[PDB]
Paper text:
To gain structural insights into a putative complex formed by FtsH and YidC, we performed single-particle cryogenic electron microscopy on detergent-solubilized membrane samples, from which FtsH and YidC were purified using Ni–NTA affinity and size-exclusion chromatography. Although SDS–PAGE analysis indicated high purity of these proteins, cryo-EM data sets unexpectedly yielded high-resolution structures of ArnA and AcrB at 4.0 and 2.9 Å resolution, respectively. ArnA is a bifunctional enzyme involved in lipid A modification and polymyxin resistance, while AcrB is a multidrug efflux transporter of the AcrAB–TolC system. ArnA and AcrB, known Ni–NTA purification contaminants, were also consistently detected by mass spectrometry in Strep-Tactin affinity-purified samples, validating their presence independently of affinity-tag selection.
ArnA is a bifunctional enzyme that catalyzes the biosynthesis of 4-amino-4-deoxy-l-arabinose (l-Ara4N), a nucleotide-activated sugar that is incorporated into lipid A to reduce its net negative charge and thereby enhance resistance to cationic antimicrobial peptides such as polymyxins. In terms of domain organization, ArnA is a bifunctional cytoplasmic enzyme composed of two catalytic domains: an N-terminal transformylase domain, which catalyzes the formylation of UDP-4-amino-4-deoxy-l-arabinose (UDP-Ara4N), and a C-terminal dehydrogenase domain, which catalyzes the nicotinamide adenine dinucleotide, oxidized form (NAD+)-dependent decarboxylation of UDP-glucuronic acid. These domains are connected by a flexible linker and act sequentially in the Ara4N biosynthesis pathway. For ArnA, 123 593 particles were processed through heterogeneous and non-uniform refinement, initially using C1 symmetry and later D3 symmetry. The final atomic model comprised 12 chains and 3726 residues, reflecting the hexameric organization of ArnA. Additional variations were observed in other surface-exposed loops, suggesting local flexibility or alternative domain orientations that may be influenced by differences in sample conditions or oligomeric assembly. A previous study has shown that ArnA can adopt multiple oligomeric forms, including hexamers and tetramers, and undergoes conformational changes upon substrate binding. Although ArnA was not detectable by Coomassie-stained SDS–PAGE, single-particle cryo-EM analysis yielded a 4.0 Å resolution reconstruction, which currently constitutes the highest resolution cryo-EM structure of this protein available in both the EMDB and PDB.
Author numbering:
A (entry chain F), B (entry chain E): 1 to 34, 41 to 249, 253 to 300
C (entry chain I), D (entry chain L), E (entry chain H), F (entry chain J): 316 to 603, 616 to 657
Write the structure that this text describes.
Amino acid sequence: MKTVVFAYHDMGCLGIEALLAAGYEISAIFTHTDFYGSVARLAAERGIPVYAPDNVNHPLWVERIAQLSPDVIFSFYYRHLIYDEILQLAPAGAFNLHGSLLPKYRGRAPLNWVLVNGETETGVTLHRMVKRADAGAIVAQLRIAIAPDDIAITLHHKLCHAARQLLEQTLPAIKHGNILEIAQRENEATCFGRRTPDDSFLEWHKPASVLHNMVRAVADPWPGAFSYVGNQKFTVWSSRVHPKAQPGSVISVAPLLIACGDGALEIVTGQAGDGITMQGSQLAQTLGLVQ
Amino acid sequence: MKTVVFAYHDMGCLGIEALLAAGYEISAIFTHTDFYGSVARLAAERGIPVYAPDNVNHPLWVERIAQLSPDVIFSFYYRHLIYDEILQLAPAGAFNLHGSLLPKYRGRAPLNWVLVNGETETGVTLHRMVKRADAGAIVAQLRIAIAPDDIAITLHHKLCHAARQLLEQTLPAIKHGNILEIAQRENEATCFGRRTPDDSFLEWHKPASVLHNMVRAVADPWPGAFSYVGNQKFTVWSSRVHPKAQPGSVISVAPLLIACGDGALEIVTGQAGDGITMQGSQLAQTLGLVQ
Amino acid sequence: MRVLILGVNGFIGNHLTERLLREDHYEVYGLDIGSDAISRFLNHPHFHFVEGDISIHSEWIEYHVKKCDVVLPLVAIATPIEYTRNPLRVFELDFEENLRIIRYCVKYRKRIIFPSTSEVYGMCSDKYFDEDHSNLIVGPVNKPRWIYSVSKQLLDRVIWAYGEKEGLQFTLFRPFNWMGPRLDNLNAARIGSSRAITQLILNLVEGSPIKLIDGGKQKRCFTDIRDGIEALYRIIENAGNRCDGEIINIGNPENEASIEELGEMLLASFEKHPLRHHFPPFAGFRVVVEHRKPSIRNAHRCLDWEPKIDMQETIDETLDFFLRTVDLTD
Amino acid sequence: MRVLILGVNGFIGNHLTERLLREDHYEVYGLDIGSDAISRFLNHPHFHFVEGDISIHSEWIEYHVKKCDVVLPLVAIATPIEYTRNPLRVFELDFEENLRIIRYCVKYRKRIIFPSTSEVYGMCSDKYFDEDHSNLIVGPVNKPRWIYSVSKQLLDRVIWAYGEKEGLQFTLFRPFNWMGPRLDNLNAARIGSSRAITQLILNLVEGSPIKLIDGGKQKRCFTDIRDGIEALYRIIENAGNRCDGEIINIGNPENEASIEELGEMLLASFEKHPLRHHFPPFAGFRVVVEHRKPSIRNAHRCLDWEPKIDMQETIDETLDFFLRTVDLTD
Amino acid sequence: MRVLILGVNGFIGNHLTERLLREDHYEVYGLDIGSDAISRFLNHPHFHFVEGDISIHSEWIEYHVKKCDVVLPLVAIATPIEYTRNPLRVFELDFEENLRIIRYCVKYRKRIIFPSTSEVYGMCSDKYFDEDHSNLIVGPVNKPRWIYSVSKQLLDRVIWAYGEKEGLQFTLFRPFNWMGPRLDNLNAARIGSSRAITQLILNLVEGSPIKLIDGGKQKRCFTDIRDGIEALYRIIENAGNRCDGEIINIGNPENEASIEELGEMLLASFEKHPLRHHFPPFAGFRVVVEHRKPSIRNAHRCLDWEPKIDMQETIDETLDFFLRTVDLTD
Amino acid sequence: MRVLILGVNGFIGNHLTERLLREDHYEVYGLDIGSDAISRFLNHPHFHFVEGDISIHSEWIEYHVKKCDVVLPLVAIATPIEYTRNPLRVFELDFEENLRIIRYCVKYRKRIIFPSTSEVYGMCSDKYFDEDHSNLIVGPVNKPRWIYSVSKQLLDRVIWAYGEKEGLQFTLFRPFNWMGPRLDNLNAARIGSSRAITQLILNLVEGSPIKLIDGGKQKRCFTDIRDGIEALYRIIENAGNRCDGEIINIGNPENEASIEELGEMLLASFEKHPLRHHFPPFAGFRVVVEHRKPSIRNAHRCLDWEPKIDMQETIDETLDFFLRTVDLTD
């Protein structure tokens, strides 16, 4: 029943709320050293001890896990690595949730490349850990959809709701015991990482839909899709695609329209430098754009 | 009936939404320079230009207000003084929403001033401005109670719903025309000084209830109630009062209670320095306190 | 807290210090070459004098800035003739050294109260003198004798820059012709001695006829020393944490008074002085910037302050006191 | 003798060097961090380049000051973004080092030829711009870019002081809106060209519609490098000693033109020039300080100088140059 | 002869001065920022206080080094607050200028007696405790507040180097938790304050129940001040020149006593104090570097010195003193 | 971008430069007192040498730091006997000059990759070697070998401190026993030459008998420069921003070889050496720390790097290289 969970961020918070809804007790909450309701406040309301060490790779934390003897180990969107030297101490294993569809479509930075194509079918996988990192067998996988009008905040809300109703089904599966896994292809395994900020620069040679996903990926409060003309910075927050002259000139100012590799792009909102966000026509007025 | 509003923060956005429900058109919004909902997003989706000048006490901005010709001014929790430079443009005048029992304890930071006495009867007051700020007739007064278990964020939320449901029938009142308001009782006005840092320092001679209401009022996301012993800092995010003891002596350990001017206090949520939140056992483990 | 005021030996410095001596949590370290004007309050236990000169001692002043908590410069040269004989001396003293001090204070994150001068506005035609929005008119190009003065305004601009990138807690303040006891002499390098009042003293003691400059109708304004220092007291305690990075002025525009009416009321107050018998009579009248308005919006936005004492009483008791304390060594 | 021109890598520096190499009793040692623009003259026997930077190098500049016989300060930072992000940088470089070289020049009795700025007039309301007799109007204090600019003016005032008591051999000269071949690079933050003509070259190269500011009625004066530089030469030998304490402007007031005729001349040369086929066309005109006429009395008074080269033909050579010298491998 | 002690304001500094005043051919000039701890000694003619700070004055302390014959460094921060707030500042300051003192002293060939810190051992678990052949143990590198302590050990090494290259006579001397009358407060930046004993004094004055931390079986030892100070007298007189290059330790192995017995004699001395009526009563017991053995072989081989005074009565008298002299300043 | 290499003339410096010329966005202006080993790459268009020595030049180094975009120190004393011949010089060179360059880079916010030494662990008794949690060991004072090593470790500590209080972007990286072409000479003050492999160079080329030192069981790990410099590329480009404030180790743990197998496969690769008949045969065998494993978890976590080249290949082709480059003159 009682186990020591390692969690972090709102994914971890929601996991704690999920297992609490089923009556699960947490011996200790090993999180990293840190507006939403803090899990620390909730755990203090329940009166249960908390520890947040910088690292568990000492004999001392080894003996904590030894005599606490947890019964099942989870991983909600953890940032710091848990390498096999700690995975050995787990009696029943470790189950990590990750937001991509295994085993297909792996590579570099899956999150943005599922946004590039705007796929209506994505998924989130709860999977095991083995001697080979992130190569354990699939335990469960769930499917989700992407709407054409989704902004970052609302689709994050969707993924939280998805985690909710998914864990609602995974909790009975684990309490009943071990669940049969589904094998993967070893010839299609990798190790994922992150991206660079320099991807925010708007290469206007890219297609209109591609630029749409680029604008989508940097929605508020991400740094934003920034570009410079002369010595002037700006960032675009939202835009649409609409169906002459040589590509590269600005067709109209009110509304401001930009020619691209295919079709035209109409900018809804942008911020110029450090100034507040405003619609395209005033931006073109200050920037001196021409029709 | 086009007007220029000056709004800021979530009561400002709420006033914008209420005015939009009335059908009033905003020529431009003179908002002050900036987790709350930024007005820029809604102004972009609904298509209203928004201007944020560093100052409006110039010939050119007042020429702009003259050409737009607003018919009304609204004030949502404004900070600065309104000198006649703004009072002259209004044909119908200006009207301010304030969260206090005027004319008591007027001025900057009235939030602590109204929670000093912890009334079970406080609300929101609309009023008109004259050459002397906060001296015009009261338009409406709305009341709500505070429960002993109310936390600062829930009070703010309740003030927000109260503002919505109040504006809901105050906007028709000004729509139908002028109403004979109620004048201020000048026989209830006083003036005081400033606030000292000692209000942050948890001193132990005032009785438990008053500092309890302050502590529950300065909860997160406010800095919190922090105090030092020796060279070690802590903050009390929340507490309860438990019922003839020497002040300064440690009463108990598990649970732990603190002697105060009247009654006894108990820490349930709090954190030392920059650490995680935890009930007082671990804090007294680091400090070393025993009964 | 600890206060270090550069140039303790002076009118404004002495007054502000003696005002501070009523609050018990102040330790005062006052550095200057001279201590004659502070010859009474030196024995006060928490005030200690320091023989110094910012031109030479460098580590010494900076050590003071480190041990203290707030630093207030108050030194400036207001001698017109020195503007012509050796403008270079004043140029590298009143500009360079204090600029180094501002750099030091920024480097080690110290709060600064800087005294600016009211002469930067000039002759703006608007009914309200604005500092960042009004226009400027200047004098002839061919005269460089006052170039030093406008240089001081440039120094203010430097402090302005310190706002936008470092967030320094600077408080720029400008006297508008304060008055009070323990005024300064002709050759004393202390500001505050309005040419009107000083000219009145000299025309009485020398007994020369009153020059009605264009009929003596040119207007002037005056301010009380107490109001200024209590204002500075509230910024030093910084009531409400709203005074940081704010520009505050202290003045009494309702005191619009021409030289003639000053003459009549000051005489109407002075002919009642009993000991006049060792003072020559008056010799008759001979006939012979112009309109300045301060802004007091920021004052009510931060401190809510307002002046009390009625002026002619101040001027006549000060005149009586400087009349009864005539130096016998002359 | 020995000539040091500090800031050799630039438009005016390069043309000054080209003019100086036309006479036989000069040695040219140029000090700067870069040498790309003057790499044509390295092979010339009397040219000698030295890497330097006034911000960091101190001994090198002083050693050259000792060894040389004429010293020409010429470089200035004109980066717009640096004005906004870090005014402290431009203040800490552009002011104090230059004052240091002026003071060394005083200590070593050296000629100083300082390039004062022509933008001091601003918005003078008089129909005839004057320098020392007309009034001056400046913009608001809230804009940050003047923060540096105004100090430059104060800087000039300092050398003016050196005129009176010690009589330093100084000359403030003001170029007005110059042009000539070997144009500056697009992204180079170097002065030497008008913004109107530069934006016009951009409007041609990018083919953007020319924005007619109020019909393009704003009148400007343009000068040629050759005439002004020969005038500079005859100030360098300082014939008659009469240029001491003299402030010299350079300009062609007669050659005053609005934007409109510049556009007409641009179209006239553009529709005729043959190599156009690698460039985009013009997209038409879109409809959307105003008059500057400086005095040139002192130039006749001291040197008797009258300009020769006109305005249109120089545009033709400059535009033909910047059209033909675009690298085909782009 | 002539003695300079840098860091005159101290506990051990006060006792050292007090004992030097017994000898008749010693001139003491003590420089430090404050003189409160030595306020009794100000009036004594042969001691002269100097307001100063080693962080700032450089040539001036060197002038002291010139005028004297022996130099005694005594400064170090033992206050935990600088470790937690900004350990880098104390690391850069209280470390580097010490090497400045050593370099100046070796240049001038001056006699140096430096107090090494007892923190270089750490937690050595080796059975054979040694000071020059055993190893030292430090904790995790993740924490910065020990960075400074270990560097102190390095400083000792530097002094050692100065031996073989110029032959400077150096004495690394190490007091260990000396206590006696005239203790120091918690926040005093003076070495010699064993946090254990001070915490015991706090437990007594507060009158809180005696907290038996793990039964109080931890063992401690204590030393007398005057026996060590007379040892330092014999080093100063340099009997036989046998102290050069030898590390001297002063400690009492025999007074090896647990916290429990210490507390028993502590109450046995406290319960006879008459002034208990201003004091809370005995609240009762409530249950909740293991050993340092000093090798005194070097002390015998250099001085033939032994300790004489016992601890118990001195601790009782110091307790009674600090109970009688409770700060009357309510 | 621009890269500055302090001490580019060396094994590591030459290899880093040679591989950095494979990329097209690098400008290398390398400063050191010598350039003989980089005679081949000095002519490369973007590689320019600067004769310098940080012990004398002060503004020069800060100039290069400002003008560049990344600064990489590469100098270190790999000479053990120099630790004893004049220890003061190595203390004055290795410690505070480098502290100065770190402070200078702090003032300028430059990305610093600091080459920490492998001696940070020293002789830690714990079997499970850690980097930030295990203990550290220092040697006896009478043995001078540690006076350098331990102090070096302390400097590393200092850099880390500049992280949390100054916001410095630091990259501590430690080279472990690299090898490759262009082997270092006997007296080269550049790291990158293992005592073991160099000793074998003496044994073979000098023709000394093979010492069977206690059987040759102690084991060492070796690295190739290519893997490391590829790592330095992925840190310079900073893939994923995950190396900020992290400590990274570069080594090859799995391929760990004792001396006996090293000598055996050396003799194997020697028996095939083509130029053997110009070098005298072996003179016969003569009959005569223990564990070091690296923890490279952080390197995998932040970079995902793996090693490629396996030792015997580098060993035999490098031995063949330095055997065939024997001076053919004699």
